[PDB]
Amino acid sequence: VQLVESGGGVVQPGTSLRLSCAASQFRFDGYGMHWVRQAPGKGLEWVASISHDGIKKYHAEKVWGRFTISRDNSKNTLYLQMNSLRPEDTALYYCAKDLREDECEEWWSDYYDFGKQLPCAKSRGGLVGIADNWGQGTMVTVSSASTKGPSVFPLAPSSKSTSGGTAALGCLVKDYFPEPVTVSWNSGALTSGVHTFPAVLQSSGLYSLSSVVTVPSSSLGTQTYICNVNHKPSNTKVDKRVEPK
Amino acid sequence: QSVLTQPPSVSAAPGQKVTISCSGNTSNIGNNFVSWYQQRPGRAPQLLIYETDKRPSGIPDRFSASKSGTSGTLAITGLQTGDEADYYCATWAASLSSARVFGTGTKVIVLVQPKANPTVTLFPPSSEELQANKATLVCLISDFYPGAVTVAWKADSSPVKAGVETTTPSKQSNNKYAASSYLSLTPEQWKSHRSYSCQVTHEGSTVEKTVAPTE
Ligand SMILES: *[C@@H]1O[C@H](CO)[C@@H](O[C@@H]2O[C@H](CO)[C@@H](O[C@@H]3O[C@H](CO)[C@@H](O)[C@H](O)[C@@H]3O)[C@H](O)[C@H]2NC(C)=O)[C@H](O)[C@H]1NC(C)=O
Secondary structure (H helix, E strand, C coil): CCCEECCEEECCCCCCCCEEEEEEECCCEEEEEEEEECCCCCCCEEEEEEEECCCEEEEEHHHHHHHEEEEEEECCCCEEEECCCCHHHCCEEEEEEEEECCEEEEECCCCCCCCCEEECCCCCCCCCCCCEEECCCEEEEECCCEEEEEEEEEECCCCCEEECCEEEEEEEEEEECCCCEEEEEEHCECCCCCEEEECEECCCCCCEEEEEEEEEEEHCCCEEEEEEEEEHHEEEEEEEEEECC | CCCCEECEEECCCCCCCEEEEEECCCCCCCHCCCCCEEEECCCCCCEECCCCCEECCCCCCCCCEEEECCCEEECCCCHHHHHHHEEEEEEEECCHHCCCCCECCEEEEEEECCCCEEEEEEECHHHHHHHCEEEEEEEEEEEEEECEEEEEEECCCEEEEEEEECCCEEEECCEEEEEEEEEEEEEHHHHHHCCCCEEEECCEEEEEEEECCCC
C-alpha cells in the first residue's frame, strides 16, 4: 500500500489551497479514506473522512464550512479543498486509508475462465474509522511572511541570571523566515558554555530561537559579548552587543 | 473540539512494562471502540490496536489494550528501545463529531541513561523589545534526561494559558535534552503584574524561576 500526498506549501491567511493524495497498490474504490493533520510538535487531529464511493463525508468541527473532502475513483485520488485558511491550520496533513473494505459477498465468474470475476453483485462495508495505512504527509504553512531576516534582542545578564560565580546572557533571534539561522558568539572566539536552542514556529508563522552562554560574573565588566546571527535565505549577517544590566 | 486525555510521558527500563491511559467521556470512549497508533520520531503513524484490543498482523503480543467505562489502557511489556515513540489513542464514529477524536499523545521513553535534572534560565523582555511595543519572556531548559518536560507559566500566582509556545525536546551533543518555552505578552500585561514565573516539571519535580518588571 502506498499513499503520496501533494499540494502543500506556504500560503497566506484567507487564501485557498487544494491538497491531493494518490493511492497505489490497493483497490482504492473499495476503502474509505481520511485526512489527519499534525501541527508542528503537537498531536494528531482528525480533519475529514469519506466513504469508499464518495457519498458520505465527515468533517472536524474546526474546519466546518471551510474544508471539503472529495475523491475521484477514476484517478485513485483523494482531495482536500481548504478555503479561508487560518494560521491555526498550519500542520502536516496526512492522507490515510480506512481499514474496512467494501467487500464483495456474492460474485459470479466467467464459467470456463473462472479466474475472471464478474462485477460484484453484492457487497457491504462502510467507514469504520480505523486508519491502517498512512502517507508521509504534505506540509501546509499559513502565514503572511515573506523571506525575512531576524530581529535580534539581547537577553541581558542580571542578578537573577547569576548563580555564583557564573552569569547567563543570550540573544533572542526573533521573527525570521524561513529556517535556518546560525548563531555564534564573539565571532566564534567564545564557544565554551554556549547553547543554541531549536526554533519555535510562532502562530504568526515566523520563527524564533534563542542562544545563551554562561560566563564568569567577574568578567561582565571587562569582557564584551556579541552574538553573531546569520540568515542565509535573506543573505543577512547581524551582530548584537549584549551587556548588563 | 473535545479531547481524550493521556499522560504526557511514561518511561521504564528496558524489559519492563508501561501502561498508557486514555480518559474520555460517554460520547466517545464510553460508547465506541478504542484504537491506538504508534508514531516513531520523524515518521508517519502506524496502526497498533483496533476495536479496543485487536492487533494487526505485524504487531507483537507485547502490545495489548482494553477499556473500562470511559477510559482505555494500552500496555507494553518487554519494553525495548525500538518502542520509543509517541502513542495516540482515538475513537471514530459516524454518528457525532464529538466521537471523532484523538488523544493528546504520550511519549514513551526507554531509560538507558541516569536521570539528569534540568538547568532552567528565565529572561524578561528586553527594553529594546518593549520599545518596539512587544514583550517575550524566554524560558530555556537544558541538560535533562529523560527527554520530556512540561512547562507552565504564571502571572503573579495565576496560571497563564494564552501566548505560550513550547518546543519539543531535542537531543544535545552530550546525549541529554534541551527545550525552550516562550510567553508572548503585551507591554501592558508585562508591566501590570508584580511578577511572572516559568514552572518546569521533569519526572514529577517542578522547579521555578521568576522575573519582575521592576528588576
Ligand atoms: C461529558 O459530556 C457531557 C455532555 O456531553 C458533559 O456534561 C455537560 O457539560 C456541559 C459543559 O460543557 C454542561 O453544560 C453547562 O451547564 C451549565 C449548568 O447548567 C450551564 O451553566 C452552562 O451554560 C453549560 O450549558 C452540562 O450541564 C453538563 N451536563 C450534561 C448532562 O450535559 C460532561 O461535562 C462531559 N465530561 C465528563 C462527563 O467528564
